[PDB]
Amino acid sequence: SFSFGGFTFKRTSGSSVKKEEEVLTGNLQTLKIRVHEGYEEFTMVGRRATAILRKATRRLIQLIVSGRDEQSIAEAIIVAMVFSQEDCMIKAVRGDLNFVNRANQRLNPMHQLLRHFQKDAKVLFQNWGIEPIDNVMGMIGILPDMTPSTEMSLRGVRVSK
Amino acid sequence: QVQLQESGGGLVQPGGSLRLSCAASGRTFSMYAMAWFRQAPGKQREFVGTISRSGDYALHADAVKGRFTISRDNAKNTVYLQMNSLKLEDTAVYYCAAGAYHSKDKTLYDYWGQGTQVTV
């Protein structure tokens, strides 16, 4: 098990093959990322939030998240979007990403994207995409403005209060 | 927490326009999703539209979509309903509601208003 964004990730089902890919950000900057190519299921465990993740090759399929605060749910969603490696998240980067903090702390590209959206995630949520939802027991929706909804939700995100 | 009172109703000609307003007196207006319902004579409440806590994402009914708009100003604690190309069939009492969820279920809204008469 590995840690990412303060969340503990564990693969429960599926398989993937790591592949290096060169991607282009929204600020026209190149990055070398290790793409886990294949279908996978993960469990995300944090101090204030918990979620179940489903992904494919650079595609988030399903994220069922719970937590104590609306802020703690936002934290889990962002991490899942960055871990998904989707193009909607890469192309939402507004600025060139550094790989070394001011106090010489080297960072890998995936942690570079995580810190960029942990700071400001308005562009990510706006351009991630919304989708209609069906009245399913224990599953509610949430909008790019963290507004709960029983009719729409951020694409693939379903809060389980 | 929140009270709701609607205004702006009255008689208009078919094909007219009427912007309804719903003023709120409460603590955290910004943290409340809103909606508009309407009850025609001899019929139950009908969903018109809902709106996000920010105001960015709105959703309307199949019978008013394209002719009606829902908007809110969180600095004045008011949510408005734009009514366009009004029809004789729009004649009903229009209600204002507030709650936690952006929905079509009248039961999910906790705080309701009084209703304003609109006749076309």
Numbering used by the authors:
A (entry chain A): 322 to 482
B (entry chain C): 1 to 120
Give sentences copied directly from the paper behind this entry:
Central to the replication cycle of influenza viruses is the viral RNA-dependent RNA polymerase which transcribes and replicates the viral RNA genome. The influenza virus RNA-dependent RNA polymerase is a heterotrimeric multifunctional machine composed of polymerase basic 1 (PB1), polymerase basic 2 (PB2) and polymerase acidic (PA) subunits, that catalyzes both primer-independent replication (vRNA to complementary RNA (cRNA) and cRNA to vRNA synthesis) and primer-dependent transcription (vRNA to mRNA synthesis) in the nucleus of infected cells. PB1 houses the polymerase active site, whereas PB2 and PA contain, respectively, cap-binding and endonuclease domains required for transcription initiation by cap-snatching. High-resolution structures of the complete viral polymerase from a number of human, avian and bat influenza A viruses, as well as influenza B, C, and D viruses have been determined. These structures have revealed that the polymerase is a highly flexible macromolecule that can assume a variety of distinct conformations, enabling the polymerase to perform both transcription and replication that require different initiation and termination mechanisms.
Five nanobodies, Nb8193, Nb8194, Nb8195, Nb8197, and Nb8208, were unresolved by cryo-EM, and as the C-terminal domains of PB2 are disordered in our datasets, we suspected that these nanobodies may bind to this region. To test this hypothesis, we purified proteins comprising either the cap-binding and mid-link domains (cap-mid-link, residues 250–538) or the 627 and NLS domains (627-NLS, residues 538–759). Four of the nanobodies bound to cap-mid-link causing a peak shift in size exclusion chromatography; only Nb8195 did not bind. We also determined the structure of Nb8208 bound to the cap-binding domain at a resolution of 3.1 Å, a product of in-drop proteolysis from crystallisation screens set up with the complete cap-mid-link construct. Nb8208 binds to site 5b interacting with residues Glu391, Asp466, The468, and Glu472. The site bound by Nb8208 is located on the cap-binding domain of PB2. This region of the PB2 cap-binding domain packs against the PB1 palm subdomain in the encapsidase conformation of the polymerase as observed in the dimeric polymerase bound by the host protein ANP32A. Nanobody binding at this site severely affected both steps of replication but had no effect on primary transcription, Pol II CTD binding and polymerase activity in vitro in agreement with the idea that binding of Nb8208 affects formation of the ANP32A-bound dimeric polymerase. Nb8208 showed a strong inhibition at the early time points but viral titres were not reduced at 48 h post infection.
